[PDB]
Amino acid sequence: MSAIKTITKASHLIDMNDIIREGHPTLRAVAQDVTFPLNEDDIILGEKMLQFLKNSQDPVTAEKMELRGGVGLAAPQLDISKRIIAVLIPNPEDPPKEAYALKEVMYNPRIIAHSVQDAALADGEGCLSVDRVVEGYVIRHSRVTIEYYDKNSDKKKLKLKGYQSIVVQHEIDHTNGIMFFDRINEKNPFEIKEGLLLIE
Ligand SMILES: [Fe+3]
Numbered sequence: 001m002s003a004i005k006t007i008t009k010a011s012h013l014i015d016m017n018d019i020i021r022e023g024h025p026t027l028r029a030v031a032q033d034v035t036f037p038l039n040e041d042d043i044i045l046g047e048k049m050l051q052f053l054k055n056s057q058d059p060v061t062a063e064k065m066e067l068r069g070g071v072g073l074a075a076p077q078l079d080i081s082k083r084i085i086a087v088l089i090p091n092p093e094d095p096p097k098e099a100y101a102l103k104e105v106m107y108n109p110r111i112i113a114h115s116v117q118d119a120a121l122a123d124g125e126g127c128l129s130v131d132r133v134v135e136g137y138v139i140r141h142s143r144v145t146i147e148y149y150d151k152n153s154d155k156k157k158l159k160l161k162g163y164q165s166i167v168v169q170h171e172i173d174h175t176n177g178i179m180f181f182d183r184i185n186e187k188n189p190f191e192i193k194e195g196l197l198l199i200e
Helices: 003-007 040-057 059-065 162-174
Strands: 072-074 084-090 100-114 118-121 144-149 155-160 197-199
Touching: 003 040, 040 059, 040 072, 040 084, 040 100, 072 162, 084 162, 100 155, 100 162, 118 162, 144 162, 155 162, 162 197
Parallel strands: 118 197
Antiparallel strands: 072 084, 084 100, 100 144, 144 155
16 A cells, blocks of 8 residues: 555554655655545544654654654655645743644645745754755745645645744745755855844
């Protein structure tokens, strides 16, 4: 059976062996739109992705399952070429009353509006699919508005800034065959063009 019929089995927990790595053709393919109302595979696929991000963020399940920690994940990294992403972003400590800043599976997500202003994480970016070091500022839009459908096949619109905007952009890129290192300037990886906001 397919990566999707396999991952959606009730017994299946997503781990690192389900995540394909830089070099695999499916990471460079343009993902397929999902059709609505959502089939149950697409629905379970999303719950599994969010459960993987929980697992990967919990010290005890992570070390035991041998997971590398994450806050976003996209179906193409599971060798399922569909426009599906999961984001699971914890609220900052200073330990929060509400666990997560953003927790969402997005179907056919796309940027319909973005700020002129660019931004990048100061510490660069990483990817579960990238098993090497790639240093440099990954240049993104500071703010974005996304159109997407939720698990209820309901059309949503959401405005994002800072850290969550970066994450969502990262994951949407996967659905378009684009890897973070594509947005690093190879000439000077730590070049700051005027205007660039760094997220420290
Ligand atoms: Fe990634």
